[PDB]
Each structure stands twice: as C-alpha cells, then as structure tokens.
C-alpha cells in the first residue's frame, strides 16, 4: 500500500474500476416524477454493490476495521456515485449519462421536483473536467481520495492519501507539466472535490425528501445509507 510505486498505484486503481451498469428504463411509458426517481435509486442501489468491491481494492482500505470501512463508505458513497456520473458524462456536453440507456438533458430532470438544481451542478462539474482535460488516471486517484478523505475527520489513512498525492504529481510530470503547473493543477483538481461534497449534500437532502414524501420506495441498503447522514 505505502510500498506501491506510483505506476503500481495507478494500475491497481484502473483494474479496480467498477463496470458501467444499465438502468431499468422502460421506453414504453412516459416518465413521471416517481418513475424517474425509481430509475435513479434502483441504479444507485445496484452500483453500491460494485462500489463495495471497488473500495476493497483501493490500497489501504482493507487494512481498516469493518467499522471504519462502513463509516468511510457511508460518508462518501454519493460523492463517489456523482464523480463517476460526471466522469462518464464528460463526452456528452449538456447531458448526464446516468446509464448507457439513460442519457438525460436538464429538461428531463425538471420532471422531478428539486432535481434540475442538482442536475445543473453536475453538468457544470462535467464541463469543468472537460475543459481541464481530466485523464482517467487522474479520475481514479480523485475517486479514491474521496473514499479515504470524506469520512476521515469524523495516521494510516493520511499516509495513504499522501501516496495518492504523490501519484497525481507523478502523472502530471509524466505528462510534461512544468513544476508550477503541477501544483496548480493539483490544487484545481482538489478544489473540485469541495463542489462534489456540496452536490452530494444536496442530493442526500433530495433523497431524504423523496423518502419522506413516499415518492419512491428505497432499498434497505439505500435506507441505511441515507440514515447514516
């Protein structure tokens, strides 16, 4: 973990990437607020299972106690789903690729009360990534940083986070960025994580309101994840 080189760090993270899943989108019927939220909560639920497998393959994560592993995932899961969504929407300006069969524009997000506000932030993050030309190697480092950092303040984790910082710098130097450009781009990337936190908190409040108005039934897992917030 702390003995991995940067290249080994990147290879392990790339090989751990979860698959892209399909939604239960039924094209025979129009969208309603309930059926659209139903699709997103069903997808998130199936993605969480693959998330767990992925987190076990993030170096340093298996070293933690089960309780600490639970806490980190409880804190970060929606940030992780969202940075994944933004990443795979990068090559679809103006749209969010929730799934290959669920590629939506903001007009479709207006179907769910309170959704377009979060939709617009995700679109803006995707545009930010596109203009910075975020690389897949950088993306997987950022996603692992979220897993380890978001719940951390609530030494080993910090040593692993430092290794990931080293790996980001190594990637940037390998790509030919000057020394000044390296620390500038590191800062620009890490500052986007503050916005991803923000969007996660809005989506968690949105999911809570969907539950509390009986718009869609949440799985037992989703209910416990919500409940930890």
């Amino acid at each position: 973990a702390l003995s991995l080189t940067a290249d080994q760090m990147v290879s392990a993270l790339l090989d751990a990437e979860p698959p892209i899943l399909y939604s239960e989108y039924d094209p025979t019927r129009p969208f309603s607020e309930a059926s659209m939220m139903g699709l997103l909560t069903n997808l998130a639920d199936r993605e969480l299972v693959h998330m767990i497998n992925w987190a076990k393959r993030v170096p340093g994560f298996v070293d933690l106690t089960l309780h600490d592993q639970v806490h980190l995932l409880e804190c970060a899961w929606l940030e992780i789903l969202m940075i994944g969504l933004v990443w795979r929407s990068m090559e679809h300006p103006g749209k969010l690729l929730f799934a290959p069969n669920l590629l939506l524009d903001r007009n479709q997000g207006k179907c769910v009360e309170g959704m377009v506000e979060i939709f617009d932030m995700l679109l803006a993050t995707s545009s930010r990534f596109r203009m910075m030309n975020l690389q897949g190697e950088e993306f997987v480092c950022l996603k692992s940083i979220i897993l380890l950092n978001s719940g951390v303040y609530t030494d080993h984790i910090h040593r692993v986070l430092d290794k990931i910082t080293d790996t980001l710098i190594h990637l940037m130097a390998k790509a030919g960025l000057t020394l000044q450009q390296q620390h500038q781009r590191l800062a620009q990337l890490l500052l986007i994580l503050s916005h991803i936190r923000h969007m996660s908190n809005k989506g968690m409040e949105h999911l809570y309101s969907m539950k509390c108005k009986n718009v869609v039934p949440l799985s037992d897992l989703l209910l416990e994840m919500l409940d930890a917030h």
């Binding site: 767990i52 089960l66 309780h67 639970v70 409880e74 994840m225």
Partner: peptide, 10 residues
C-alpha cells in the same frame, strides 16, 4: 448489523 457491514464481508 448494517447491510453494508455484511456486504463488506461477502
């Protein structure tokens, strides 16, 4: 235990 606790083991 939490669903998540069990899933982390399987």
């Amino acid at each position: 235990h939490k669903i998540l606790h069990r899933l982390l083991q399987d």
